[PDB]
Amino acid sequence: DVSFRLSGADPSSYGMFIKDLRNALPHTEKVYNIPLLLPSVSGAGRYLLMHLFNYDGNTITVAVDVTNVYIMGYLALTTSYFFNEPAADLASQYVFRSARRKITLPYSGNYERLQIAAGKPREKIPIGLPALDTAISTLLHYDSTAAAGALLVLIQTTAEAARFKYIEQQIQERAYRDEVPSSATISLENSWSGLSKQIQLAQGNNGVFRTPTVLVDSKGNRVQITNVTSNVVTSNIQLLLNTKNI
Ligand SMILES: *[C@@H]1O[C@H](CO)[C@@H](O)[C@H](O)[C@H]1NC(C)=O
Ligand SMILES: Nc1ncnc2[nH]cnc12
Numbered sequence: 001d002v003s004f005r006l007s008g009a010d011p012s013s014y015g016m017f018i019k020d021l022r023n024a025l026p027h028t029e030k031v032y033n034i035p036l037l038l039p040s041v042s043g044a045g046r047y048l049l050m051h052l053f054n055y056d057g058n059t060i061t062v063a064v065d066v067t068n069v070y071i072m073g074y075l076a077l078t079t080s081y082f083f084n085e086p087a088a089d090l091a092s093q094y095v096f097r098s099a100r101r102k103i104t105l106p107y108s109g110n111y112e113r114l115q116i117a118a119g120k121p122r123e124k125i126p127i128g129l130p131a132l133d134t135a136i137s138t139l140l141h142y143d144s145t146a147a148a149g150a151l152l153v154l155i156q157t158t159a160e161a162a163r164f165k166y167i168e169q170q171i172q173e174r175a176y177r178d179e180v181p182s183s184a185t186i187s188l189e190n191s192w193s194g195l196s197k198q199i200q201l202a203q204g205n206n207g208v209f210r211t212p213t214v215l216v217d218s219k220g221n222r223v224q225i226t227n228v229t230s231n232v233v234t235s236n237i238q239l240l241l242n243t244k245n246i
Helices: 011-023 086-091 111-118 129-140 144-163 165-173 183-202 231-235
Strands: 002-005 027-031 034-037 047-053 059-065 070-076 079-082 101-104 208-216 222-227
Touching: 002 011, 011 144, 011 165, 047 129, 047 144, 059 086, 059 129, 059 144, 070 086, 070 129, 070 144, 079 086, 111 144, 129 144, 144 165, 144 183, 165 183, 183 208, 183 222, 183 231, 222 231
Parallel strands: 002 047, 079 101
Antiparallel strands: 027 034, 047 059, 059 070, 070 079, 208 222
């Protein structure tokens, strides 16, 4: 298990949590020096539990699939909550079995459905450590519309930060003040599977992507990533989605 406390949190303690989260994900291989997530894991071992504590010390436990860093569900006091999708239903067979009741959220866990449920796109939802404290608090008591927004915050400040050093740094910048994600952040989120695939295909293609990945950069400009010498590959992406899962 990995844990993060908002009470006393700073960029350093958040950095430590994101390190712990990455390190909890198993791999047997690195591709271009980046850990390659496993094709599959059987049984309860598929799921990492993240213990998150709000500023007041209240807690939720979040279930994360270690193959793809996908949040499947969470436990808040004695109630479990899972996304409305087959992978989350499967997860519910292994985690939080001792919850007094299980609620299936009225949406799946992808960004398209969550943004619909929340009534707003990610571009308009501030993220940061304060927003993560809010999100934890929101999830403690069921409210499906409020929970959609909370879950967009939770996913970007945990899973997305684990996947990309740039996103981790963005959240660190937002330790004490929320701000909507940069368009580069949005771009990276949207591109992880694509990038993961191209980095793997580059092995056997002399480091060259079979298909260029289009990203938005820090200055707001749109760029093509064509090979493993890109900063996105050398100094940003931290985990690879196995092509078996693409
Ligand atoms: C690889 O990417 C860099 C930019 O990141 C580019 O300038 C260079 O020409 C590319 N090399 C090849 C072989 O595509
Ligand atoms: N539930 C989820 N967990 C991790 N990353 C995601 N990206 C979109 N939905 C996600």
